[PDB]
Amino acid sequence: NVTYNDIGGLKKQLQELREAIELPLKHPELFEEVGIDPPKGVLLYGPPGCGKTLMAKALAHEVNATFIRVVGSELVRKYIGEGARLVHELFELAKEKAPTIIFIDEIDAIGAKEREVNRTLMQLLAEMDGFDPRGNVKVIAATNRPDILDPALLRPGRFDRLIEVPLPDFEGRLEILKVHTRRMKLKGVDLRAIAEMTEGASGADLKAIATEAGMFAIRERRTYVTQEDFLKAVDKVLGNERKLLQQIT
Numbered sequence: 001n002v003t004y005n006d007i008g009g010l011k012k013q014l015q016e017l018r019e020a021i022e023l024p025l026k027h028p029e030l031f032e033e034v035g036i037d038p039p040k041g042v043l044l045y046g047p048p049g050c051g052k053t054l055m056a057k058a059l060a061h062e063v064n065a066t067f068i069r070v071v072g073s074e075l076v077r078k079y080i081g082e083g084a085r086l087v088h089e090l091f092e093l094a095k096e097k098a099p100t101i102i103f104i105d106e107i108d109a110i111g112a113k114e115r116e117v118n119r120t121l122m123q124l125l126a127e128m129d130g131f132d133p134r135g136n137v138k139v140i141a142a143t144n145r146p147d148i149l150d151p152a153l154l155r156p157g158r159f160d161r162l163i164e165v166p167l168p169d170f171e172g173r174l175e176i177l178k179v180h181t182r183r184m185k186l187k188g189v190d191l192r193a194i195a196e197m198t199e200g201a202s203g204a205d206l207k208a209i210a211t212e213a214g215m216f217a218i219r220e221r222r223t224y225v226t227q228e229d230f231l232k233a234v235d236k237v238l239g240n241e242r243k244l245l246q247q248i249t
């Protein structure tokens with residue numbers, strides 16, 4: 001279960017997403033009053049593990065909506081017409097369960113400029129065309145490779161708003177570290193230091209660092225968590241050791 005309080009370092013990105021969906025949904029009345037149709041799709045982009053799915057999930061909680069997630073790669077099918085059918089069913093289901101947030105991760109797998117997948121693409125855009133705003137089912141897509149995308153994905157009525165979800169900067173990381181260490185008791189711990197030593201980390205790495213910290217404490221049998229635990233969790237999660245593994249698997 002996810003809420004805005006489970007998210008760190010993305011204050012303006014959240015506001016933007018909220019302004020694009022939460023705001024209209026609540027007071028749609030008041031948008032037509034100004035001549036602006038509420039967006040149908042929002043595209044989130046940036047490197048992996050930095051909060052894109054989190055924002056979409058938490059947004060879904062806050063508007064009390066069904067949250068349906070599909071990974072783009074799985075809409076690529078060996079057999080003809082299947083990719084398109086799935087997208088069709090996806091949208092039917094999302095109506096069945098309205099209101100809903102559809103979250104299509106790795107939308108690049110389908111929205112790249114073999115030709116079957118373009119069929120699959122046409123279907124989705126077809127689906128957005130025809131949904132009609134004001135507006136009960138909303139789509140959120142995510143990619144780490146945005147520059148790839150067919151611009152027909154981005155025309156108005158389709159993935160209008162773009163929001164970059166970056167690697168966390170120094171303060172972001174601090175915020176994120178707090179989110180995932182809020183429910184531990186630490187004593188020796190300076191998190192500014194941890195934030196300083198993790199340049200380039202993602203939100204996920206940082207969660208992993210807090211997680212590896214607490215278990216390090218456990219394996220050395222204490223009940224609290226200390227700076228040393230974090231210094232080695234930082235060294236475990238980041239750094240060659242897990243690096244080579246990745247090059248290895």
Ligand SMILES: Nc1ncnc2c1ncn2[C@@H]1O[C@H](COP(=O)(O)OP(=O)(O)O)[C@@H](O)[C@H]1O
Nearest residue numbers: 006007008048049050051052053054203204207
């Ligand atoms: N901005 C963030 N704030 C708090 N936790 C985060 C953040 N970004 C990533 N995480 C942690 O990493 C995990 C993956 O985040 P997710 O939103 O799935 O990343 P992606 O951008 O790959 O969709 C989440 O479960 C979350 O706990």
